[PDB]
Amino acid sequence: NLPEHWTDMNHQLFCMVQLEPGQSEYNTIKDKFTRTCSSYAIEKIERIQNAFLWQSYQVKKRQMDIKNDHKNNERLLFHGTDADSVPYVNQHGFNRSCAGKNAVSYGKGTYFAVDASYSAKDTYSKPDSNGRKHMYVVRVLTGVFTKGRAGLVTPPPKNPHNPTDLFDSVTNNTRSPKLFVVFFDNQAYPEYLITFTA
Amino acid sequence: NLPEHWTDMNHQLFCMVQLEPGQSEYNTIKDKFTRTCSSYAIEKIERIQNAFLWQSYQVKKRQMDIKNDHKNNERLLFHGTDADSVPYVNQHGFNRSCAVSYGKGTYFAVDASYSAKDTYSKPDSNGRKHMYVVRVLTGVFTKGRAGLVTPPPKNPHNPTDLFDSVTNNTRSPKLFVVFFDNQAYPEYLITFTA
Ligand SMILES: NC(=O)c1ccc(OCC2CC2)cc1
Q1: Which residues form the PARP catalytic domain (chain B)?
Q2: Residues flanking ligand 1, CB < 6 Å
């Protein structure tokens, strides 16, 4: 069930694949990033091939596609992180139990940005000791979403009289979304790792 | 890929099925409980049929069987909870975000007698206590400690290859803690009284 464009892994479960500039795959990610980070320079873009994370994520997507019926449940978003976090995210994905309190909090979960410029802030993509910054391009199952609130440990219910039927994620603003928060494992697949510098 | 002992769900994805007293499945689950809790009165046992939770759980079980290079990754454990949390656990399973002296995960007991304490299975206004029988992917485990947010690494020369769960005592475990969604499937709900 692994995507057929992935490199052969020789029955290995995990692989990072360096992309070539001028390939459509590299160029689409570069254009998405430079739309709002034209003042930074990309060192490299690696495709993340993680069989187990992919499998769990694709099971969740199919469940949300069945439950929501005729919705675009997936967006491509950005996530800046520190170099210390990269090994863990590459193997295990995004753990809400490890998430920082955001400067504007819409709930206790993992935060993903619409614009690379948000994730490019030193507060999220902290420069390592060689001055490299790290940002993931992430498939996120945002599904049906509402404006979040600082107290949330799960998405709120759609209906107060049915407390277990939940929104899929929350946002800062439903009309003009700039960030999404997710509260469950395997709701986000880290697809690419951008390494960049001033 | 829904198990054989489940009953038909008329094309729905979630239902709670009351077990018939005196039949094989009811007798099997009652005996697990009464091993340590024979002084308690059983009102009913329900089979939890949650297609989505089962699917996600089965994927994690297949992945752990590959990673550990053997079966024997699954244990049947108990979880006592309050009446107000029962609809959430039936629909969404166990959530670490909702005493945590062996880590910030979900706690499961080897013995029903431990989960039957009023501190976990809080009596509701009518005296009814609630306990799940849970399939748990305990896998390879180590001793836990306060403040863990994931299990420790097997070798701190490879800090991303983790233990699957933690316990109070590795030689004679009486409880297990898991730190990831869909590492536990709530299989039966026992309603009982002191
Ligand atoms: N909810 C439960 O059934 C349960 C709760 C706690 C527990 O271990 C607590 C540990 C001694 C500190 C096991 C099970």
Answers
A1: 2-194
A2: B 78-80, 99, 101, 107-109, 114-115, 120, 175
